[PDB]
Symmetry: D4
Subunit: 164 residues, 8 copies
């Protein structure tokens, strides 16, 4: 069932990752977007195995109405940065926890982007993935007060739960 | 009104945070810049963060080094996007700064950029991209700036 | 009443932080133990830190992992000695925890101890040594305890 | 007589350890400062540590770099609180110093502060806070000190 | 025609990358050198990599620092061997550069050499060794050069 | 005759080094595989390296962990390209392996790939790319293999 | 009587330190093994180290993890060669152990070997090499052992 | 100027390094040997630039009367380990402080030797070099009481000077 007939169901966030195994990490961002009723798309897009496709994905993101891209990658983690080099939409990079170096390689490859090409970097692993969802929502919430108000209530409920 | 707040724990961090501000001026984005210390002015930090939204800010850029708590603690107190710039520390060259900022727990994102001056520049650009995702004039300016760099480098 | 406050950012930290408490009980030092989160209950953390002295506390032991801000931010809000226990984090094995706690700037000390359960045990003993600096009964009991371990390891 | 002992492995560490002493001076807390080397004067280190309490010390601040054993070994030899300052080493920039001090085993705490001069300042302050857990006068002065810094920073001149 | 392409993400990398070029000059291996930026000229980078083989290049030497994506992104776009030189970055002393280059996933190798100027020297030598696997003349020249250095080092005082 | 030599310091490295060999088999590239230890069979190592060219090898793939000297010492003894695979070591997870291999001094390159099994796969592919620089058929098979993967991933 | 002393901070360190002792057994080198703790038995440590030479020991092998002070503090108290084995620690996988052992200051060498069990084996071999530099029977036994391994690796090791 | 006629002048320690630039670090070892009147030789021997020469040097060390080899190296520091692979004399490895990684690569390349091939590893840089010299002295002093006694007095003098 398509949703071309609902502007409000059209993707605002693109959630991408270099491999299907990254989905174990990237699902957390998507759970947040589900919780906040923010429409999104999720795809495998590999910087190294599908480079042309990555460029196509990045180039067309804004015309397709995406406001934010969330990109996860591990090791020599180039996906977030190369997507960022190809769009001026904000790009959030989630370092996936790699086998040998526990995401230290992931983190440095993503966060140390040169002047001109920011990537919004979050924590290694599942906390970062959750936080990518939330940051995408915060970005949407800088224009849409309803989303902002919902983030406030969500945080307020957690505070109460933890404190009590 | 100011749309971006640029803050830092000490005046010594201004040497890093200048770059962010130069970017905002370049893109004609109104901003405010202040010293706001997580450790030396904690109450003031909470007041700044709490009141950001009411005051009209849309994004906060925060720089700090060492045990770099300013970005995360501001981020705990507002649902503005918070961009954390790791300042290069003396002994550990910003590794402490980076891990203190990027490793935030689920619930409280900080958008972390590169250690040092490159990060600072990119904080300004990132703030602009957040605004520019909805505001075409800012997006168009970002695309032009990037286009001119591409041409310079290629040619 | 309680002379030591033992706090931590999440209930999952309790596995680590129980060790400090086991020490306080052993030594018959009255204490309280609470979940106080820098990032999820920031206002509550400030209130806890602010009031600690008025409430009779002499030392705070605070455990946290990752971007471990709890000990430092508590220490920014009280002049009680604050002892920080770096909880061993999943990806970075407490390297992030350690640097986020120990690298505090001039003005706001945190007494930092080892990553993990060893650190937590030592947090209890250090709170006791601080109390024992003005309470002979606690100092003597620390000396007796160390003497007993010495003889058992040797013999 | 002295309430805090400030010790260090080498004369070169004094550049770092001065900062602790300045804080103690500012707060009018009596102290002594000495070179005590874990590796070059091991016996002298054991004597300093075991006799600190009878000499009237309440806290020891010990600085060292590299394989920085001074704080931990002093801590093994007294139940005074021992504060360890990792001195910034040449090759590894105090990473070796830090791990050597902070990673003490169950039974022998060392209260560890930041690498280098910020750490040294904070060791002074921490020693004060420990004394302040009994001396209300010292606690109060620490509070006024911090409040004065807060005002200076909050009301500082605008960035240009 | 050039046999080797030497590329780098910024003119700031030239101080490092010259060392590779000096080796190619020494061995009379023809090459081209250009600034090609993964982050500032991404389309141009893909075009460079795409056309390399048709242009007659046999190997690419690519230098970058920090979030060092140039070597790997070029490697994704050509099956010529790609040698990655980690340029020493300011804060992290090339640790970021190295991990960003060497840790490539299965399918897309990058031949990684040492951080900084030794790496750069060695990138030239490795390019030459790759050519020397077919060209006996280059191989023999490599042997002679190494032999002369051996004599110089052993017989020095 | 074999065009590639695949070597490793110990039989326990075979679990890693098989990935390279699988690639060469896939591409029908003739190769030999041997345990050759820098530290336990140093003379045998020099003989292997010395004679590689005469025996018809064009590239050597060498795997080693820890104080991983095998790739570099082989590289010191032949001007064949030498590809170094850092085997993941127990305590330091191949960090020692990596630095031991990659940081070769000027004069003696080693073509270094990723720690572990990804690296091993890539050493096979890199050996093939080196051959493919002078064997068009191998280059074209590499392109075909990558093209199939691209479609599988994309679709 | 014992030529090598093998010491460690806890009985659980035997899991690592056994390997050094296996090598000494294999080479018929007489030794003693003891739990000696830098932090839990500091005075006992100093006494062990002080009297080593008079007791007839020629080399000490010391294992320790974390803030690993045992090797260096023993080395501060004797001019016997001291070999330090970094025990693999839980959080930091012996990086803390390694740095706190190897980075000893000028005047007080510790001969440091690899993290963990391979280091332990190598401490036994290195003690043997120190003895064997003057004692032909031990040198000969080391050469024989190394030679047998060379043959095994070269002529075994057939891959599948 | 030869000393074949003096058994006591013949080298007991060999101090080797891969490049003349390493001499700035390795001289400290040699200063200690001078101080203790222990005869020694110093040579540039490179694992990577003179591999055959390194094997020769290691092979012949024992029969030349050497008791101990001190080897300094930086970066991918293979010299100590490869010498240790070729002799059963004790080998002391000095990690030289490298430019980019400040001797971390040096240290790991030297210390992490596999079972069977020990290298006695000392501190990064000049402190290690000094200690290489003292450790070689300690090894000789395990047989020669005069050297051991000299080590004790040297340490005693330093102790007094520091304590006072």
């Amino acid at each position: 069932s398509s949703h071309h007939h609902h502007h409000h169901m059209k993707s605002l966030v693109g959630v991408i990752m270099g491999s299907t195994s990254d989905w174990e990490t990237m699902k957390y961002a998507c759970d947040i977007l589900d919780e906040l009723n923010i429409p999104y798309e999720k795809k495998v897009v590999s910087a190294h195995r599908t480079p042309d496709y990555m460029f196509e994905y990045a180039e067309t993101a804004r015309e397709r109405g995406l406001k934010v891209i969330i990109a996860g990658a591990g090791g020599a983690a180039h996906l977030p940065g190369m997507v960022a080099a190809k769009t001026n939409l904000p790009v959030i990079g989630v370092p996936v926890q790699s086998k040998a170096l526990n995401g230290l390689d992931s983190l440095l490859s993503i966060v140390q982007m040169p002047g001109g090409v920011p990537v919004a970097t979050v924590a290694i692993g599942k906390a970062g993935s959750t936080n990518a969802g939330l940051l995408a929502a915060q970005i949407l919430g800088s224009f849409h007060d309803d989303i902002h108000d919902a983030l406030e209530l969500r945080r307020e409920a957690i505070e109460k739960d933890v404190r009590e």
